[PDB]
């Protein structure tokens, strides 16, 4: 009743405070010091920007569960749902693009010279925001407020047939934000580790071999964190769509806990992608 409410609201609050702190701290260090002069740092800036906007949706979601209704009104409901879906696809496609970036960097080094330029990094990033706009713009239209039991509900209303288009969007979110990115992330990083073992710089002495281990572990955690975060939220929506489940105190927490893990990746994307890079570590050591 009350202990459950304080548990879920704090769960959002911890994810929101740490998420807004980490994301804006990475956009601060890059703009102040780096000034986006490097191709890789451009992707990290677009990653932190997409995660911060998604993290911004969390106080609105918090209020929605706590009050049990949406008090923000119809015009903001259109905006808040749009920022939720669009920046989810934008963040995950940036994870895919950095997977493509690190794959070309190691496995195809000659063509990486064409690929890893600050001019090309700006073009592919803009395409990521454009590809997310393909689902971002319809979410802006379809989102409306529906009165249910005198409580405003901020949700995506679909054209007739309602059952067909609602599940069709759930499949696309399942495929394009989970199934296809896992194929992108696992294969490209997996083939990257195979090429790195072939490279004789990381092979050899124990000190050089140890650097191979830390890169391989950092790659595997990056693959795992994407898998650990987004697998509960995607499957549980599918199970909720397929099988009607009774509302329970444990069932209520499970829905929001899987949502919290989805944003937990966005919280941990500064830690993995930005702070663990050696280039950023030189900046904090110097400054």
């Amino acid at each position: 009743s009350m202990i459950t409410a304080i548990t879920i609201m704090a769960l959002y609050s911890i994810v929101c405070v740490v998420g807004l702190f980490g994301n804006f701290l990475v956009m601060y260090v890059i703009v102040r010091y780096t000034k986006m002069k490097t191709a890789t740092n451009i992707y990290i800036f677009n990653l932190a920007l997409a995660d911060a906007l998604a993290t911004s949706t969390l106080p609105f979601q918090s209020v929605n569960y706590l009050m049990g209704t949406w008090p923000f009104g119809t015009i903001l409901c259109k905006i808040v749902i749009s920022i939720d879906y669009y920046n989810m696809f934008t963040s995950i496609f940036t994870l895919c693009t950095m997977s493509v970036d690190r794959y070309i960097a190691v496995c195809h080094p000659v063509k990486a010279l064409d690929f890893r330029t600050p001019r090309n990094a700006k073009i592919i990033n803009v395409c990521n925001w454009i590809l997310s706009s393909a689902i971002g713009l319809p979410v802006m239209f379809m989102a409306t407020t529906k009165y249910r039991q005198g409580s405003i509900d901020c949700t995506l209303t679909f054209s007739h047939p309602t059952w067909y288009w609602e599940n069709l969007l759930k499949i696309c979110v399942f495929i394009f934000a989970f199934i296809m990115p896992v194929l992108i992330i696992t294969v490209c990083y997996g083939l990257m580790i195979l090429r790195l073992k072939s490279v004789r710089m990381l092979s050899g002495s124990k000190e050089k071999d140890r650097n191979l281990r830390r890169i391989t572990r950092m790659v595997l955690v990056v693959v795992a964190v994407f898998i650990v975060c987004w697998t509960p939220i995607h499957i549980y929506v599918i199970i909720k769509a397929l099988v009607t489940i009774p509302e329970t105190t444990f069932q209520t927490v499970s829905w929001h806990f899987c949502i919290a893990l989805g944003y937990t990746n966005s919280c941990l994307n500064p830690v993995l992608y930005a702070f663990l890079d050696e280039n950023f570590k030189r900046c904090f050591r110097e400054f």
Binding site: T40, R102, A105, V106, L113, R200, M201, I215, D277, E278
Partner: peptide, 20 residues
């Protein structure tokens, strides 16, 4: 020596990514 030149580019790209 082409292997060695490519090997340096890999090291430059890994330093570019920040992993190395």
């Amino acid at each position: 020596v082409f292997d060695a030149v490519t090997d340096v580019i890999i090291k430059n790209n890994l330093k570019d990514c920040g992993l190395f």
